[PDB]
Amino acid sequence: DDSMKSMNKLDVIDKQFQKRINGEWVSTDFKDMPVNENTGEFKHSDMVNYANKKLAEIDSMDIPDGAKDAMKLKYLQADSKDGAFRTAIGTMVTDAGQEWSAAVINGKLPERTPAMDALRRIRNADPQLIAALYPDQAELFLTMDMMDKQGIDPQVILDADRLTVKRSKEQRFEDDKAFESALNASK
Amino acid sequence: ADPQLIAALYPDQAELFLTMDMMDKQGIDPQVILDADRLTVKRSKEQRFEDDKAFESALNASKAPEIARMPASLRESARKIYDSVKYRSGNESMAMEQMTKFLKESTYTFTGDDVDGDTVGVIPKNMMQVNSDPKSWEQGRDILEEARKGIIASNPWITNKQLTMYSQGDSIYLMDTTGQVRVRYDK
Amino acid sequence: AAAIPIAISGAQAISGQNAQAKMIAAQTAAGRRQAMEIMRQTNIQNADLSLQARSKLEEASAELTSQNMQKVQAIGSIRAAIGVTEGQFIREANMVTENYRRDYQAIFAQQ
Amino acid sequence: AAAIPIAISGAQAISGQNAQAKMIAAQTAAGRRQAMEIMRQTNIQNADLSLQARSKLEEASAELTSQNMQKVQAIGSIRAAIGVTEGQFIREANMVTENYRRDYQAIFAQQL
Amino acid sequence: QQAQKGAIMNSRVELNGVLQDPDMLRRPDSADFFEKYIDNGLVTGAIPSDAQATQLISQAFSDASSRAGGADFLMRVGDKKVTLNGATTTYRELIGEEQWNALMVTAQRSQFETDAKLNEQYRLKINSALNQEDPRTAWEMLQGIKAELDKVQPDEQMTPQREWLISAQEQVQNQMNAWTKAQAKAL
Amino acid sequence: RDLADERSNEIIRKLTPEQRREALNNGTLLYQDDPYAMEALRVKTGRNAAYLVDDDVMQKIKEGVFRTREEMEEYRHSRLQEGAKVYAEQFGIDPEDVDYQRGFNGDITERNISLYGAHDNFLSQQAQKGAIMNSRVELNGVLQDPDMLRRPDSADFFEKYIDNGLVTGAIPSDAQATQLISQAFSDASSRAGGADFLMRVGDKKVTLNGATTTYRELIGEEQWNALMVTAQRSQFETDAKLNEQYRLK
Amino acid sequence: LLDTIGRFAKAGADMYTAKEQRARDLADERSNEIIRKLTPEQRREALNNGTLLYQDDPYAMEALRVKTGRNAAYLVDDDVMQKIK
Amino acid sequence: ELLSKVWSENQKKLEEKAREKALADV
Amino acid sequence: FGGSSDETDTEGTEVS
Amino acid sequence: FGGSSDETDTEGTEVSG
């Protein structure tokens, strides 16, 4: 019964998000989702369910991978900012960042770098929006730009991060004061 | 089988649980954690005052819903995780990332479905859990979000920004900015 | 006689230049073989080829297509589709002899 | 003659691709032998078995099942259970000749 | 013991080879085959233990109730007489009545899930064609999908597959028009 | 030993199937001493021997390897014998018994039908791929030239070529014919000669499965407009590019 | 003639499909003769289905061989031309 | 959103006029 | 190269 | 593939006696 109801309401959410992409500025709140009496009561879980299944579908299409990345951006443009596409892509970003931090701690880079590859694809689609919606991982985005856009060896960056693990508290304040001076002296 | 309940039942072993999580779910080598432990956690007590003040400072400057509105028991668990990662790595960023990761894995942040009604509350995930299955916290989440929507809809004068969700020792409290409306959700 | 080993190295360099002119042909042959391998691996049927199947099919065909005699192949295809004696007729049309040398007597008709 | 070593290496690479196409068959044979070991070592007595015994039995059975000829297994087993001359009849029913080439005379009977 | 192991392996192979194929499950000959096969195995001496015969029967029923065509097979075989012990009963009586209901429900769910997955795959193909970078390629893919339908189901019309295909054709015509506008604008 | 086993079997055959069965579940009867059950076991094992290893492996090799039928025959004979022996020795059966051999040939004819038909399908697929790629090569060589596209006989060539492929048996299946036609039209529309070529192939007719119609109607009218617009843009773009090279010189 | 010499050349011995090879040639000729008895529309219809099988179609295979040979000739002459230039 | 709105308006009108001209030429 | 690339155009997600 | 996995049932503890 739940499979039937979910199959029906993910289609409703798909129509609503298609309207959202096409420009018809519509809500994404499950209570505003229409109910056709074969749908159910739109529990909040079905929204994250729809986002996950949609992302898997986009990855599963026979289109060029660039178009896959473009549609992932399109589906992430168009959420409530509480939306499950934002949450899923932010999960992708944090998992890539965790993978980088694990590499730094281990002193070597892992193989196959799954989260790093996925975020690399979705970011090479559009670096600016990904950086905007996820400013916290600015260091991670810079690291990826260093590794692929520039020719910098990941091992060198990794060793540099491993050695620079002494925050020293006072060193942080001196960094603040030096940075503010660097800005107000830049011209 | 169920991480959050084991963590709750044995708070003193939060550091051990963190090391095991780093070894098993994250990609960190056991050896690097071992020799990080063995190496330099030597500074003691006199800088533990500054460590305590730095933990409170990092909470004060966090600007994050999980850390700004950290629930009560997760305060002690998160302090242990932050202290442990700071001792092992020295990096304050690594400690903050680990402590944030723990809080996000162990809590759900209810958000106001608005332009900004954001962060109506951060509830520990085990308090919304129905039955023994750890994944069933989502059912309690759906119940709680339906409760929030029903409270908003029933009383028009309450808006999305008025509701606060917070957890006492064994209860979840959903209240508006005034005290007129409080409903208590317990395990 | 240090001039002899350096002369040997220079002749080796010339041999290596000809060798590169040989590896270009070897690379063309390897490309043809790998294209026919594509032909074997891919499935052209069901009329529902995946996008990679279309790309592989197109690139394999482009490999088996001849670039240098592309024009004469095309004109031969057109002649075959549209429509000794024929051969000599087109040789006289090309003002060329039996030995495939220019027939100047035919070319300089005005003179 | 830098062409010759690279040409030999490429030919050896294709030979190793043939080796891979043989590795698939060799590893299928190894899997079947290992399933045979499972069948012989595992105890079937008393029909009272652990999950390990049942899983080992199922894995052995699956590896002794034919995948390419599965439908042929099933149709043959059905034919045996329900109930020279038979082969001729069933090859006529498939419109195929004795040399197992297609018999187009029977196939194109409507169109002559 | 060796002979019994071989007999059980042979019986298992034949039986699950028949019953793990939904195409073979869907024919009435499947149920007739199952009845006659259990009978012959009992009489010949194969399936040596009535205990092992019950094991084989239960596992065959479980396998069928996991495939697409299993539910039909179970309806047909439910009223088939069998003699395991001294008494003779139908498979509906040999299996528990509640266990029969469980088998029936899980077989129905398996059938629904399989049909839903097949529809997901078909509409995935349709939408993958619809989201091509070049709409002419989309037209090519749609004509290929039309060829596949015209192979499998030439006589009928207005089947859900056909309705989806027609909608895709119309959408690709709209893409044709938009592509024309874009190319003229580029010129 | 088989004679001693046979006289034991004659002793046991005097028992009815039900009392035989209940002896079988008890320890009174040994399984190998049951003649009917053991004959069934050997038949099933031989059938599985012939089927499983030999023929699934054969089919796997067939889908990718076997150039001709004769190679398949000898490979099949060799594997049949070897697999019979090995599958028997893995079991308790020795591969010299009447029942085991009867099982090994139990459905030889229907196995043969399936296997030979699968190889015939393989050869059919190989021939179709060969023909389709030959047709791709020919049409690419013609339509990918802006010079060849501009001939006043390029369109008549294209119609005649498609008709010849349909009638003779090349470009097999009307579906792949549509794919070839559409890809040819796109290539022409991208190659600085598609304007004239498309104006000239527009009125030409092609006979598909549904009916005979002009290429303009086979292609979508909206798709025809898209093709013409992109062909005009290709004409203009190539003109501008060559003009720019000359200006740069 | 050519069949026997090819049999001798390809393999030293143990080729038992010689009379069977001639019989298969006869069967191929008979199948081709049956196929020509179909009208081109009927032949196309059988080709569209799984009926004609496309290797027994004499016209289609004849075209296949002709175009393959012509393309192979053009590839060899492509190599020669690239060397000439 | 406003920037996208004005751009979409101008782009739509330009695309209409360009397609009309191109089809006229064709 | 004689082949001219077609314009990249903005695309809207479409579902049957 | 062909088989569809049965969706999970809530685990409960039972004793014969």
Residue numbers in the entry:
A (entry chain H): 375 to 561
B (entry chain G): 499 to 685
C (entry chain T): 4 to 86, 101 to 128
D (entry chain S): 4 to 86, 101 to 129
E (entry chain M): 188 to 374
F (entry chain N): 64 to 312
G (entry chain O): 41 to 125
H (entry chain H): 686 to 711
Please give me the paper's original passages concerning this structure:
The bacteriophage T7, Escherichia coli podophage, has been employed as a model for the investigation of the DNA packaging and delivery mechanism among tailed phages and related dsDNA viruses. The tail, connected to a unique vertex of the head by the dodecameric portal gp8, consists of the dodecameric adaptor protein gp11 and the hexameric nozzle protein gp12 (20, 24) surrounded by six trimeric tail fibers gp17 (16, 22, 24). The core is formed by the core proteins gp14, gp15, and gp16; upon virion adsorption onto host membranes or the receptor rough lipopolysaccharide (LPS), these core proteins have been suggested to extend the tail channel and form a trans-envelope channel for genome delivery into the infected cell. In this study, using a 300 kV cryo-electron microscopy (cryo-EM) and defocus refinement with Z-height correction, we provided improved structures of core proteins at a resolution of 3 Å, the portal–tail complex in mature T7 at a resolution of 2.7 Å, and the portal–tail complex in LPS-induced DNA-ejected T7 at a resolution of 3.5 Å.
On the basis of our improved density map, we identified eight copies of gp14 between the gp15 ring and the portal helical barrel. Each gp14 molecule is composed of five α-helices connected by four loops. The longest helix α1 and a shorter helix α2 in the gp14 molecule enwind the portal barrel, bridging the portal barrel and the sidewall of the cylinder formed by gp15. Helix α3 traverses through a hole on the sidewall, and helices α4 and α5 bind to the outer sidewall of the cylinder, which is surrounded by the genomic DNA. Intriguingly, only eight copies of the gp6.7 loop II were resolved to interact with the inner sidewall of the cylinder formed by gp15. We speculate that the eight copies of gp14 are to adapt the symmetry–mismatch between the twelve-fold ring of gp6.7 loop I around the portal and eightfold ring of gp15 during the core assembly.
